[PDB]
Design a protein around this ligand. Structure first.
Ligand SMILES: C[C@H]1O[C@H](O[C@H]2[C@H](O)[C@@H](O)[C@@H](O[C@H]3[C@H](O)[C@@H](O)[C@@H](O)O[C@@H]3CO)O[C@@H]2CO)[C@H](O)[C@@H](O)[C@@H]1N[C@H]1C=C(CO)[C@@H](O)[C@H](O)[C@H]1O
Ligand SMILES: [Ca+2]
Length: 840
């Protein structure tokens, strides 16, 4: 209640009283005081000598003259004595007068050191360190930890009497696509659970708040007009988006993004529009794909079934590997005989991504050889570097203990499968660490060969076969050639010189019997035809054939029925750094050097109520995830990722890349509280609009980004922006909130001292950043052009988006809560007499 009276505390107690009752003599947060707060007293004991008359800019720790309890005063006195070379300690029976005289001595010698040592910085550090020793002011009162990635979270109370500026009518949690109405959707049964959880990392954005929802749409419009807005260059806009962390945010965002793409880009009218803005989800629940399909196929999800199938049938260690038939049937699309003009559901397919099956491997290495107590993905840079030593040796072993086997086999399937958009991971062609595109992996040659051949040969219907041979099994996968959807189609000239056969085994012990025959039906267009190898497993790796002349001596022929026939002389198991099993790829002889069997999207009207259609034109696309979490930091400008991308767009065009998925371009925060802010990938940020504008991002300056987008567009490659509405990191201004310790679903942890309790968070942006410039700056334009976006009543809330408020400054009122900050349950100071919080 406004008046810190200093009585029976410190011998010097009438000089230490507060300068005035003004708030400007206290370092306060929302007019509360913290254990680390400093204040301006009336007099300063200058050099610990003379009670200097004035105080001006002379702020001193409040813990120098005031304490919450006598026990804390004693702890402070013992601590500060040790810090200042005063060899006296006071145990739990010493009395008040002794403590006040000790505190006076400590004050005097503090002021001596302040005038000796130039500044007060050391005192800030020493006071905060002491405060961290106190359980009411550190992690101890925030325990027990839980399986939140960062050990826990607190949820901000919607009605806090002491913090009404942080109140909310929303904070509706866990409204995943499965759980969007607050009840588990009865349509979707592949996932038993509620399909996600609200609290993932750092400060959790409340995407149930209509004002926030509107600001998310503002941001989306900004990214898709980045060229126009920042550089007045319409050739430098992002073309599409990736929706990050779908299962940790309110699913209303899916309708908002879809609606926006329909209204602003017309993706629902024809395939040309849709494919010009092909947008994706990172949505891990198996309900998300049927959900997104019922929603209109306005975006596409990953095929997680196919992914797991590749992982467990090919990538895992030999003794943990599953049988091979899942590669055919355990997918969105059963590829036994895929003869459809248009598959039932669109999707993209991958084996590794910047996060998936990379940071998992680094964590495995750390947990098993460095620090067994590693928490989630909260690595230190030192742990990361020691782990990449192990990782990089394992990559080249024949017997891998940590990294994937059979990468080239995985890509042989991904890049010749029908009915999916493959997404190539950067770190599978180039090293996961090091400078951008500086070092090829051992699989670069095979993968590049596959990408080029995909342009030239991959089209038509598909047939996958699983054949038990000798002591093991193989699969064949065949594409019939352009224009041949069914195996009986005899084709035209281009059919004859396209199509492909892939043969794989996942067991190095594979031995065929002398009587075994692998009869690969190529299709009715390929009777009595010469075929040559594209990829062949060898003893030490994979031989790639880049031309018909490079393979001139290995030609073989189909019989009169269009069958290639293989025996033990052709197929056996191998064990080398690239293959644990067997891989062979064959193409028909004689395709023109410029043969291109891809197909452009039609402008014919769409008539089935979906926007994206998995047909030959979409199957003609290739997505490229163009970064690695663990890229080195550029040492000179020519090593900047976006600079290098601009310098190699010819390479991406020759690989058939149609969609370049760039890293998130937001300037990263540097708090190091998660992997993303340690290696600074772009997913941990404080300013949604700072795309390398105030400072370069890890990939270059904003002009480097503009030039990279233009260079990609100059080859017809579309460019994808990473929409990250889940969380934000490292806000520069503190705020006092009413909070409750919770699990990642928002359920309160009992036995917790944080329960409708004052808590100090970092949750205000500066008001002088890009957010303050652009926040809500396009809502009037968007409402004017597209009123129906603001008319829709969103599913989770029952109301429209609310664009009547612009978010120029983030504040706790717009967030569900935060990961625990190690500040404790009692950081906000109370008058001990009245058990009342101090306020000004
Ligand atoms: C942090 C990163 O992963 C997050 O999701 C993880 C899931 O919680 C895992 O369980 C795993 O999914 C399995 C499902 O739980 C399971 O039910 C099944 O349906 O599918 C999986 C097993 O087959 O997947 C994730 C492991 O990475 C989170 O949802 C995801 O969005 C996160 N990655 C992006 C987001 C951020 C934060 O902005 C960044 O940390 C990353 O770099 C982004 O890529
Ligand atoms: Ca969330």
């Amino acid at each position: 209640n406004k008046d810190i009276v200093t009585t029976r505390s410190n011998l010097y107690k009438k000089y230490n009283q507060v300068y005035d009752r003004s708030a400007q003599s206290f370092e306060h947060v929302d007019h509360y005081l913290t254990a680390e707060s400093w204040y301006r007293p009336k007099y300063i004991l200058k050099d610990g000598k003379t009670w200097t008359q004035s105080t001006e800019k002379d702020f001193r720790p409040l813990l120098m003259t005031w304490w919450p309890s006598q026990e804390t005063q004693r702890q402070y006195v013992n601590y500060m004595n040790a810090q200042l070379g005063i060899n006296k300690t006071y145990d739990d029976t010493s009395n008040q007068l002794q403590l006040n005289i000790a505190a006076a001595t400590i004050q005097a010698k503090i002021e001596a050191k302040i005038t000796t040592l130039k500044n007060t910085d050391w005192l800030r550090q020493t006071i905060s360190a002491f405060v961290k020793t106190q359980s009411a002011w550190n992690s101890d009162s925030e325990k027990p930890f839980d399986d939140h990635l960062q050990n826990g979270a607190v949820l901000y109370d919607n009605e806090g009497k002491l913090t009404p500026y942080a109140n909310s009518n929303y904070r509706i949690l866990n409204r995943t696509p499965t759980n969007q109405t607050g009840k588990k959707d009865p349509r979707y049964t592949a996932d038993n659970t509620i399909g996600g959880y609200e609290f993932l990392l750092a400060n959790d954005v409340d995407n149930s708040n209509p004002v926030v929802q509107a600001e998310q749409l503002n941001w989306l419009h900004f990214l898709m007009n980045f060229g126009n807005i920042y550089a007045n260059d319409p050739d430098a806009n992002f073309d599409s988006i990736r929706v990050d962390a779908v299962d940790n945010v309110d699913a209303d965002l899916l309708q908002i993004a879809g609606d926006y793409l329909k209204a602003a880009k017309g993706i629902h009218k024809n395939d040309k529009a849709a494919n010009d803005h092909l947008s994706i989800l990172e949505a891990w629940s198996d309900n998300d794909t049927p959900y997104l399909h019922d929603d209109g196929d306005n975006m596409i999800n990953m095929d997680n079934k196919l992914r797991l199938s590749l992982l467990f049938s090919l990538a895992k260690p030999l003794n943990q590997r599953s049988g091979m038939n899942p590669l055919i049937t355990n997918s969105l699309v059963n590829r036994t005989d895929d003869n459809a003009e248009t598959a039932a559901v669109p999707s993209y397919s991958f084996i590794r991504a910047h996060d998936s099956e990379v940071q998992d491997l680094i964590r495995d290495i750390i947990k098993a050889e460095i620090n067994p107590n590693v928490v989630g993905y909260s690595f230190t840079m030192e742990e990361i570097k020691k782990a990449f030593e192990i990782y990089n040796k394992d990559l080249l072993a024949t017997e891998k203990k940590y990294t994937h086997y059979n990468t080239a086999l995985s890509y042989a399937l991904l890049l010749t499968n029908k009915s999916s958009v493959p997404r190539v991971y950067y770190g599978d062609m180039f090293t996961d660490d090091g400078q951008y595109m500086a070092h090829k992996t051992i699989n670069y040659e095979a993968i590049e060969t596959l990408l080029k051949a995909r342009i030239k040969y991959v089209s038509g219907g598909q047939a996958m076969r699983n054949q038990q041979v000798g002591n093991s099994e193989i699969i064949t996968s065949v594409r019939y050639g352009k224009g041949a959807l069914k195996a009986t189609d005899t084709g035209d000239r281009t059919t004859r010189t396209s199509g492909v056969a892939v043969i794989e085994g996942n067991n190095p012990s594979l031995r065929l019997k002398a009587s075994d025959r692998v009869v690969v039906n190529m299709g009715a267009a390929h009777k009595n035809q010469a075929y040559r190898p594209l990829l062949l497993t060898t003893d030490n790796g994979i031989k790639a054939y880049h031309s018909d002349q490079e393979a001139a001596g290995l030609v073989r022929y189909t019989n009169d029925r269009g069958e290639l026939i293989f025996t033990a002389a052709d197929i056996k198991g191998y064990a080398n750094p690239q293959v644990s099993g067997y891989l062979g790829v064959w193409v028909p002889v004689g395709a023109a050097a410029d043969q291109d069997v891809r197909v452009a999207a039609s402008t014919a009207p769409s008539t089935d109520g979906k926007s994206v259609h998995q047909n030959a034109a979409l199957d003609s696309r290739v997505m490229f995830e163009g970064f690695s979490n663990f890229q080195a930091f550029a040492t000179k400008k020519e090593e900047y990722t976006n600079v290098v991308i601009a310098k190699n767009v010819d390479k991406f065009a020759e690989w058939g890349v149609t969609d370049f998925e760039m890293a998130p371009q937001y300037v990263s925060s540097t708090d190091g509280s998660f992997l993303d802010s340690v290696i600074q990938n772009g997913y941990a940020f404080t300013d949604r609009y700072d795309l390398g504008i105030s400072k370069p991002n890890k990939y270059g300056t904003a002009d480097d980004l503009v030039k990279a987008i233009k260079a990609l567009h100059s080859k017809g490659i579309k460019v994808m922006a990473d929409w990250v509405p889940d969380q934000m990191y490292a806000f520069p201004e503190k705020e006092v909130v009413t909070a409750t310790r919770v699990d990642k679903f928002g359920k309160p942890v009992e036995g917790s001292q944080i329960k409708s309790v004052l808590y100090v968070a970092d949750s205000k942006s500066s008001g002088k950043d890009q957010q303050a410039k652009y926040g809500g700056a396009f809502l009037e334009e968007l409402q004017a052009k597209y009123p129906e976006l603001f008319a829709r009543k969103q599913i989770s809330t029952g109301v429209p988006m609310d664009p009547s408020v612009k978010i120029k400054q983030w504040s706790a009122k717009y967030f569900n809560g935060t990961n625990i900050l190690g500040r404790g349950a009692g950081y906000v100071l109370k008058d001990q007499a009245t058990n009342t919080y101090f306020n000004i």
